[PDB]
DNA sequence: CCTGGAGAATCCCGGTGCCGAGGCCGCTCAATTGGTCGTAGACAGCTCTAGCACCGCTTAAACGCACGTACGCGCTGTCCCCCGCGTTTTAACCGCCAAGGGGATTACTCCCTAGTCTCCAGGCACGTGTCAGATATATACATCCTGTGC
DNA sequence: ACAGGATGTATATATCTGACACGTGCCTGGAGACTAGGGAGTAATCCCCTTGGCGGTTAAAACGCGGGGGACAGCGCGTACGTGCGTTTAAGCGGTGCTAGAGCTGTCTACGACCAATTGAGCGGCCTCGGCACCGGGATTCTCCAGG
């Protein structure tokens, strides 16, 4: 009923066997008048599908009205390049910068109305609510749809208050914690169908309710490469001082406000605490790996990595853990670099390029679990270590597959440290519960 | 070459502006940190309601403003325009610290 | 039959809750016994004070070209008045600011 | 083993903020040593009020300081505050 | 649901409408007025209780309230408030 | 002999004889001490009453008295007074 | 039959009247109910404060070559102690006088 | 009666000032101090008269004066 | 002849009066002043001796405190002589 | 810049008066027993707020600097004002006496208030929508500052 | 001394938004009627304390004078502060993620305080005496002030 190959108006865009079916589904959803969620996850041309959908609407239909694509700041340049390179005819404009530049843009382009597609970040959307609502929008595209996964939030209510005809959500993993968030997404999509808060009682009804507005695909169905990854779950016991601090925090002079987060920075390394460190001098010798179980196992395991293929990518949860591992690496004088949210934005891309250089002598690369830009092509790594596990198995999976880029040839193997019989086991148990729920709901 | 105001015009304009306004002048997060640090030595592991911090900030602003008024009056008594620690200590001792 | 109840407030021509005042006096541990006319007297006094302060605040609000009374208007009304400034001398009004007051020595000449 | 410190919390209140307070008070010219004195005065005032409020909260057998506790402390000191219940 | 909380907002609004028909009031101004009424009530009642103890009585009466008002309020306000209270009590006692 | 009047005179005299065995007191000094005791008692009792009202209880207890003395008396006096009162109440409880 | 009466002052070892304090607390209308240990606590606190002030006054009177405590001695004792001075800062003592204090500027050069 | 404030004499003002701790006294201090005494006394006596009027009495008592002083924040020890 | 310097006699008087404790205003003039002030509020008023003595005590203490504050203000102005402006400044800061 | 004079203050004795300290009387309040009832302690479930470790953006506000200028401060000179002392006048102070109001106590009696039950109607929590009050721009007006001319 | 040139500030106008004012539904406390008890008003009596008056005395105040010291105005100066400007950063906002601490309605239950009647000892009032404080007096030491 629809074209099975690349249309004419997309130049040098091939639409290889997945963009074609996605675009056909999007066109069918427009014809049926129901909004949709595209959840093929990182690996498929979601941007190309949205661009080609807009090009189809502009060319085959005569409705090139007010179009808005909401993207994070880091993807603005990428989206603009895709717009200008793959559908050049659909000329578009973007909004970014300080308040005076916003005034310049609205007075020069937005208000004159010669524009067709406007691309803006979340913060600029919040700042320009009154200056954006005046246009009768036709399409509303939200990349990283899990940003609005929670109701009662400023962005969610603001995007609800917009006058729009249709909308389209882009996300990798629409379901993260519970069905309440997916209900929020569906209620935003269809304003009236899902107003309520409501193996046959479950699963089946969920699948047949979620079918009409969701898609899920796997890269390996046709890519058939990129060999799989093995996760090794290393249980590690703690040291005597770790046990002592564990008991002292558990029973209850320091600040003990959030007991769970106190036990957190304590099952990892007691030197994130105060008083565990030695006296006034800071002697970086044996006040290190030999006093924590995870650090002992890490110092046992790293030399094997050195003797083998190497290139260990390290993922952590605390920048304090990042700093202590930095001190350990400088004590061992290992080639390393540190990247986190605190790293300046320009200072991150050159670091990635240096670690991904064809001849990169750097061995240790430390990144926080969520402090990435949702991109970071770390295709040159071979070893991935998860020093900590969060409450988001989806975030853990995304951090795992961010080093699982196509370019990768050596199969990357994941490590997961767990302090047995501690709060890490609880964390992993809740993560497993959430992961099983998300899989059984979405993946099938 | 550039136009400049005399030493004292901008001060009077600021006085008019701030006596016309009603908001708070100290920063919220620094004030909260100060309050928590003070309360910690009295008793450990304390939780503060967001209204209590605002009430404390209001009282602190009012006390400091009244003290500065009386300090300025003392400085004018001493035939000066500047306020000084001598003036502050005198005002406190007269008020009955 | 049973006579239709008339509130003591409307009986005494007030706008304040005489019955609630009697309950608060009796539960306030001020004395063992409370007379009948004491809550009426107290409610009338409270109404007079409230009316005076509200009238002054409304005058200030009309002078400032706003039809709503805000704490700044309340502070302006409470100051600029000898009796009210003496009654509320040691009272801090949140979001009240201060009265415009510049000493004449500081003014340029 | 890493170390990094920012500043003291008594220095959290700033010289421009103290100048704004003095301008609202009516002060035109300010000496340079006013700021340490003002920090001392504010610290003493806060320590008194916090002591009274924490005493009230301890008597209530609670862990949370409330606006009502703060208002009661201020009223006991003789600085009745309106607008916070 | 929620626990009931009592205040003087209705009566303050009624008095405001009587004294200034076209005038509103904000929520924080209402909180200030509620605290003001509570403070004055507490002051006058405490003065009356102290008077009752001093004279070795056991009943708080209109005489005690009037004396407390004259002790608290400063002068012209006191005499106007006394006139208001006398009118109120006389109206309440005249035929009821 | 008119109606009898009470005071803390004999108790103050006993305390004086305990602390200084060879010192006497005059009538004006006794009046000053009696007024001082009355004033301290009034302050502590009023603060305890306010505490009980704030916590919505109908009793005045050792906790209310102790919190009142910690609010009123400054610092070292508060600590010593709390110690003395706790010792006395412990002996009363043990001997009852 | 009944045992001999034992005063609560003797029960707690105090010198101040627990029963009289209890009666004053009940009749003063501070609360609806009074616990048993509250009068004992209050009597102990009053006794401690009296002991402190009396020892200060007695020491001052001995320094003045006298065996009788007078309002002058009481004022000297109260105003030479920081904590008692803070407690009784707003208190006037009849026939107490003032602390001898001359500002250094007024002293001859 | 009249001309009774002038009964407060310059030597008495001087003695009070010396007990305060002053060395040199201006000539214009005296009438200012007399006015201060007048206003303070009027406040205290007005409150005491209110107390004695409530008591339905015609004699002002030391207890009434003490009650007035206490309600004005100037507690007096040694008179009842 | 024999004459002292201007200021030693004043210092001796300061020491003498700070060492003494008796009253410094004539009793009969103070009593007449009190009666004249009391005439306005009510006629045919009678007083007790203790009432007049307490009034004199409180008035003298108030004046002494005011003079201390005034001396402080005069010292702050780099002066030795006290002035009505110093009296007014002390009153204004204290809150009257 | 030391001397020595002349006042002031300090110290030791002796005599007076009175007020503190002790000893009795009588009653009124506190201690002792017994009974009860409600207030508070303890649990339980719901739900809502605070905190701790972060991240990601944005931008107002803090920070450091240069520079000239009122301003604080020290020193001087003048003058009159306040102080110190002796004289005369005045009124407080003291003691004493008389007279009468008025505070203080006691005995009766009644009316005013606590306490209860019944009914219902005002007041409170909950939604909901519309106007008054921010906010943003472009004018128009008042203030100030310096150079220019006199 | 007076113009004009730049800069802040007020005023009109249009827009938007969220909080205030109103209507609904329901429940809980106030009003009506009744009873019973004691708190307080009312009259009478006493006696204490206030007031009014007088006369002698003596300190205290009023007054005048003379002169040295402090107040006040003026001048100079060199320095700390106010003003404008570029650079850095930390506050403020918007988010996640979870768990406890207290407000809650509901509930149970038990022990601790109120209450009553009896009775006795502690405390206030009254009366009486001796030693401590006070006052007067005389000798010794201290501090200030002029002179050379
Ligand atoms: N031209 C292409 N067409 C389709 N898929 C591609 C193309 N280039 C790369 N990919 C796949 O996409 C993945 C990276 O793209 P990605 O960043 O996931 O896009 P998106 O962010 O839109 O999901 C790689 O793993 C690769 O296998």
Residue numbers in the entry:
A (entry chain W): 166 to 363, 377 to 430, 443 to 634
B (entry chain A): 37 to 133
C (entry chain G), G (entry chain C): 10 to 118
D (entry chain B): 17 to 101
E (entry chain H), F (entry chain D): 27 to 122
H (entry chain F): 22 to 101
I (entry chain E): 38 to 133
Question: What do the authors report?
Answer:
Here, we use cryo-electron microscopy (cryo-EM) to visualize the continuous motion of nucleosomal DNA induced by human chromatin remodeler SNF2H, an ISWI family member. We merged the datasets from all conditions and performed extensive data analyses to determine 13 unique structures of the active SNF2H bound to the nucleosome. Based on the conformations of DNA at SHL2 and of SNF2H, we clustered our 13 structures into five groups (A to E).
SNF2H adopts a canonical open conformation, identical to that of ADP-bound ISWI and with similar density for the bound nucleotide,7,8 indicating that group B structures represent post-ATP hydrolysis states. However, the position of SNF2H relative to the nucleosome is different from the ADP-bound structures. Compared to A3, the SNF2H lobe 2 in the B1 structure continues to rotate toward SHL3, whereas the brace helix and lobe 1 remain stable. The dissimilarity in the tracking and guide strand movements results in DNA backbone deformation and base tilting at SHL2 and SHL3, which is necessary to accommodate the 1-nt difference between guide and tracking strands. This is consistent with Förster resonance energy transfer experiments, which revealed a delay between DNA movement at the entry site (class B1) and translocation toward the exit site (after class D1).
